[model samples]
Target: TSFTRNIVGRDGLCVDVRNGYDTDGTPLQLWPCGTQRNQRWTFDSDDTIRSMGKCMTANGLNNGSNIVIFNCSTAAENAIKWEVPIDGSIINPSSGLVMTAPRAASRTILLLEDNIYAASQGWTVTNNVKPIVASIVGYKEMCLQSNGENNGVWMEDCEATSLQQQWALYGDRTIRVNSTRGLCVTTNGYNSKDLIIILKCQGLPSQRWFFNSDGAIVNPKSRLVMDVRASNVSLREIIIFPATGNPNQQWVTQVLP
Candidate 1:
């Protein structure tokens, strides 16, 4: 093993390469001693740090080694990364909540929610999947889509596009994306329909979803996305609330595939 120096993020967070399990809540300390999994770090445009496997996320921007890594194999519920809150300082987003560093609350990690902005409670999209915006704790202004008929609230009557509907998360962490109609997945648990209404973006688990690295959408609770007809002719829509097995309800994303 060898000690090397690597600069992380524009802010210049230094990381020391090391080996072995960094463990959840482990501090990502700079070790000039050796190379291990604990030393690997990935920087995102949004200023979040991720592990090489994309499972671990930096706890907060604190000087101490607070890091939040995902334990997907150990516990499915522990698969998500959370932010560590700092003392007295809080960042609330217009659409999402602006979290601070060092999550000192009861929770080891800070999850995205609408408590800050309310409009950006939870969000999801295709490409770069895996609950892209299930929490708005880290995002600012994300793209939003209007009902084809423009029936929901807090949305504009502009022509809908992927940018409007699909948002590319800034950080490796997730944002809180909600449906103007209420839910991101479909109602009957089917998201295969074209233009339908679901639930509100209140940061409830029933309305959250994730886009996986493989370009597949999944309801973290159900672990699946809305599938479309194999023929590629009939547009598919998936539901969010009550997950069920439906042809129209099971859909996939074509972009970032």
Candidate 2:
């Protein structure tokens, strides 16, 4: 039996081979989203992760051993066999070692070591998604679009070239319209019926938003939530209203690759 998943670390990066090489002894490291074949992996029921027809193996059987790709081997080779238990850890079953990233930043090679369940050892198995589209509420099959900084946001049928809909929530709390353009979501003021538009990226309070636990996209400056008017209308402008707990004000994002 075979299964496939992008083994992503807690840092939100895929467990990829160094420079995406498939050669034997190519070390595995956390890298940016390359979406290449070397970053893709298949896990066999025998507990080995295979990439480029090579099994993932630790350089040594002891703790702190670096993980690498080697020729596929029999189940007797404990160094190659791994286990993914309920705790979301990649474990070397024979040695009781868990795969972990010692560093908090990217470009670090992964290692197998003692159990600690740290963020470095925690991982998630996810399928590859494309484009990173934002799905606003009430507009099923449609996504947010920005015509320009002055032209308020609109709803359009999801398109391949919809860079206007591509938003990136940054650590600084600004939601950028285009990842490369430095345009961020902004509003004129705390007016209840103001239009939400894109502006040059400025780390201002109005440009900041937080997705609350209840799935409401909120602007802290206005203390209001995203609300949609004219529910029957398509390509409508999105506005902010008081936190009324209405369904129209709630949204959940669908991540496209």
Candidate 3:
């Protein structure tokens, strides 16, 4: 995330989710007066992701757990502490599999994109992925995205109420959608602004999302994916900035049984 030198250039300490920087404990060395609040980060709905100040949790309590970001403390070592599955999913109090969590206090993991705390770039619910139903004006939308803006369609006056359509398909690659603020829609690479604010569901990488067998929901971020390019009447609003591949940002997801 940060090696400092006026602001990241070569991925030194290698954290840079896209903009936020972090040397973790400090080592990728490159100072020029670093200041992003020294790369500020905070994910405390109880999922604890905090940064610079430290937080990630689940180091000592055991399991496949291996995450460390310390300093701040409500008093639950093993690193901060986490659990967000009322419907958002991100449970790693310690390597249960979703992506370790439990260290708090200073709490550090400031990469911010592929899994909101980058649990090794979380998201992996294999089995061929599934969730779809587009339908435009007649309103039958379920691709996922509401506030960050991906309307899944559904008119009657579509204010969108089923958690914005609800979606989750782990296996094919990664794609989890459920926004209304509960968070989920993650996308980093292709640019589109590196949009990701939906939390939980744990497979990190901001909830790893991609589903392009033809189902179109690919957000590779630094690799470029979350797309939307059309001007017949204007449909370009999915974010993931730089794209030349053009499939209209690619999408073909159809799984809802």
Per-residue C-alpha lDDT of model 1 across residues 133-223, encoded as one tens digit per residue: 2211100122123343323212222223333354323111122222232233332333343322343333333333454444344545344
What lDDT score is found at residue 93 in candidate 2?
A: 83
**What is the Å distance of residue 166 in model 2 from its true position?**
17
Tens-digit lDDT track of model 3 for 18-43? 22344343311112223344433455
TM-score of 3: 0.26
Worst 10 residues of 2 by lDDT: 129-138
Where model 2 places Cα greater than 4 Å from the true spot, the runs are 74-76, 129-257
Candidate 2 C-alpha lDDT tens digits along 128-164: 4222335443445466667777668766777766667
Candidate 3 Cα outliers beyond 4 Å, as residue runs: 1-57, 60-80, 85-120, 124-189, 193-207, 210-225, 231-252
Q: How well does each candidate superpose onto the true structure, as a TM-score?
A: 0.29, 0.51, 0.26
Give the whole-model CA lDDT for all candidates, comma-separated: 0.31, 0.69, 0.37
Q: Candidate 1 regions off by >4 Å?
A: 1-198, 229-236, 239-257
